[PDB]
Design a protein around this ligand. Structure first.
Ligand SMILES: Nc1ncnc2c1ncn2[C@@H]1O[C@H](COP(=O)(O)OP(=O)(O)NP(=O)(O)O)[C@@H](O)[C@H]1O
Ligand SMILES: [Mg+2]
Lengths: 288, 9
């Protein structure tokens, strides 16, 4: 399709080799493999295929997500290497992220990273989101499951399935979504900052599910009433406060992504600050 | 984790 070729290179399939299946998505399988670049350098890639017998809607959605991804060239946003559309199966080829989805990676390593390592992950996510927001997009699905992490623990924003341009022109990830976006579809970069606060909690909780298994209706009611997720075990005060700030009821009082990046950069620059750690509550969620 | 995405009823 022409739409995708504005922002995606058409790859020659002879330059793509497939190694093994590493996942499955809405649209088909995901494999690891290799791509030979025009310079003859070979790089590791992920290869997503559109399932045989796809509908035209599935093809548009599949390629549409690539068209959005291809608009971003940033170290903390998943890199699109290109697409294959002139032969079938249709393919999307992206940089390989050895350690997979961030939530599942952290669950394998409960309490095994240093606070500075976790802050490094969080800073990358924030930097990617700062660029995404600079580019006029709202992601709408920012969550640990939609961050990929590579062999050197660099985290990158992925999954542009719900993303859109902020303009005057389906199911929602309720637990990750701001109260105003739930209430009346008010999606802004500040609603992505809310979601970032949730990702911050997910990371400091080593991939615990936000609000655990609370019903979505209770998540909506509790959050609207002013309840918030409690501090993760051994969570630095600085980082819990950042969560609370991301979760301000008034979206205009939330920090911008640029401010989040700056905050994390200071914590990285002054790691002793992380040593001040965040008790008896009448409820599991904290009021305020 | 089955109800990550949902409508509001
Ligand atoms: N760039 C990548 N590098 C390495 N692994 C990847 C990459 N992209 C996706 N994967 C793997 O593929 C899995 C599924 O792909 P994903 O992008 O999460 O689509 P999905 O529709 O959300 N499937 P799922 O997470 O299982 O419900 C991820 O959990 C990773 O393990
Ligand atoms: Mg996924």
């Amino acid at each position: 399709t022409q739409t995708v070729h504005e922002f995606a290179k058409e790859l020659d399939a002879t330059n793509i080799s497939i190694d093994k299946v590493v996942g499955a998505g809405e649209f088909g399988e995901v494999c690891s493999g290799r791509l030979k670049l025009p310079s003859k350098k070979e790089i590791s890639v992920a290869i997503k295929t559109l399932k045989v017998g796809y509908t035209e809607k599935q093809r548009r959605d599949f390629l549409g997500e690539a068209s959005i991804m291809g608009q971003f060239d940033h170290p903390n946003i998943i890199r699109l290497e290109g697409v294959v559309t002139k032969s079938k199966p249709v393919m999307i080829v992206t940089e390989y992220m050895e350690n997979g989805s961030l939530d599942s990676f952290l669950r394998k390593h409960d309490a095994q990273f240093t606070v500075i390592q976790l802050v490094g992950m969080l800073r990358g996510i924030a930097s990617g989101m700062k660029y995404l927001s600079d580019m006029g997009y709202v992601h709408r699905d920012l969550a640990a499951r939609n961050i990929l992490i590579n062999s050197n623990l660099v985290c990158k924003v992925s999954d542009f399935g719900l993303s859109r341009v902020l303009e005057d022109d389906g199911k929602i990830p309720i637990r990750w979504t701001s109260p105003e976006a739930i209430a009346y579809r008010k999606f802004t970069s500040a609603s992505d900052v809310w979601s970032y606060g949730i990702v911050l909690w997910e990371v400091m909780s080593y991939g615990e599910r936000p609000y655990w298994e609370m019903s979505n209706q209770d998540v909506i009611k509790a959050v609207d009433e002013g309840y918030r997720l409690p501090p993760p075990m051994d969570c630095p005060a600085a980082l819990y406060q950042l969560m609370l700030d991301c979760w301000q009821k008034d979206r205009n009082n939330r920090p911008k992504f640029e401010q989040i990046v700056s905050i994390l950069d200071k914590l990285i620059r002054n790691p002793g600050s992380l040593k001040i750690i965040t008790a008896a509550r009448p409820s599991n969620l904290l009021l305020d | 984790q089955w109800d990550n995405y949902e409508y509001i009823w």
